[PDB]
Amino acid sequence: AQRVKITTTATPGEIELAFEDTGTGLPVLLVHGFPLDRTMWKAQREELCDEFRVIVPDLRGFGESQVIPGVATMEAMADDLAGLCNHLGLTGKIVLGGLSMGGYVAFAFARKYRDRLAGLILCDTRARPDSPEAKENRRRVAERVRREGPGFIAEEMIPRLCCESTFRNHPEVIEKIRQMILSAPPEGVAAAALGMAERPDSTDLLPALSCPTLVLVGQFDAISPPEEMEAMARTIPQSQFVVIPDAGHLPPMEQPERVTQAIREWLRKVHTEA
Ligand SMILES: [Cl-]
Numbered sequence: 001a002q003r004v005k006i007t008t009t010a011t012p013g014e015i016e017l018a019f020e021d022t023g024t025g026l027p028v029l030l031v032h033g034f035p036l037d038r039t040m041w042k043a044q045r046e047e048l049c050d051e052f053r054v055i056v057p058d059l060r061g062f063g064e065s066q067v068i069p070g071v072a073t074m075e076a077m078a079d080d081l082a083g084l085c086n087h088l089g090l091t092g093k094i095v096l097g098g099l100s101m102g103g104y105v106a107f108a109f110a111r112k113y114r115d116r117l118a119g120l121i122l123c124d125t126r127a128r129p130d131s132p133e134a135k136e137n138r139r140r141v142a143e144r145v146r147r148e149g150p151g152f153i154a155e156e157m158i159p160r161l162c163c164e165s166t167f168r169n170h171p172e173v174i175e176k177i178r179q180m181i182l183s184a185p186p187e188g189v190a191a192a193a194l195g196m197a198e199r200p201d202s203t204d205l206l207p208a209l210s211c212p213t214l215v216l217v218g219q220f221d222a223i224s225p226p227e228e229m230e231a232m233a234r235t236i237p238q239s240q241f242v243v244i245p246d247a248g249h250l251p252p253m254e255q256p257e258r259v260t261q262a263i264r265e266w267l268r269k270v271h272t273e274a
Pocket residue numbers: 020038039040041042
């Protein structure tokens with residue numbers, strides 16, 4: 001892993017990002033969820049790198065990246081990704097993938113940097129904005145986590161994040177997720193919670209997308225359910241919809257091989273169509 005100060009068009013203009021960059025060829029940038037870190041995507045980075053160049057950053061406020069107090073908007077996170085790609089000399093097109101909050105970041109990137117996208121991978125995510133109650137919940141989480149840290153988030157979220165089969169067959173995956181959450185910087189968690197509350201509605205963005213899009217969901221995802229994601233895919237042109245069996249909200253970790261293969265075979269199509 002690497003740590004680099006990048007130039008970003010978002011406040012504060014410069015930020016230190018930690019990231020992995022593994023493989024050669026077509027760049028595929030994978031964005032973790034909330035309140036996780038780059039290691040969420042480890043299996044896909046380690047396996048897809050035989051064929052693609054896989055770049056996996058810690059978002060601002062997460063993992064080993066710099067924490068920027070206040071509000072970390074989805075736009076700002078996307079701006080940081082554009083800055084990272086600029087740093088790396090990936091100044092043309094990329095494939096951008098994200099899970100859940102990382103999907104929100106991908107929408108923000110697509111709004112602003114459409115000419116930089118060869119493709120989008122939207123995993124276990126939603127196009128709608130937060131409802132008023134959800135926004136209030138963000139705010140209450142932000143104010144709590146600043147002072148108490150993310151233990152309460154792990155307690156609340158872990159039963160909702162993975163399916164029963166993962167708890168039974170892969171307790172080590174559950175523990176790895178728990179440690180990601182417990183290690184998340186408190187102010188980074190807070191800033192991202194507030195940022196999620198202010199993200200725009202991406203409903204009308206969907207029909208305007210201009211690249212192939214893979215829409216991936218766990219069969220048992222309790223947070224961004226498959227029926228909702230299917231409906232989302234029906235408004236995205238050039239979509240492919242994949243349900244990963246025997247996974248909840250974190251397919252990349254729960255069913256790593258199946259996720260890697262779905263992404264690999266779709267990337268080959270995108271490449272052929274391009
Ligand atoms: Cl990793």
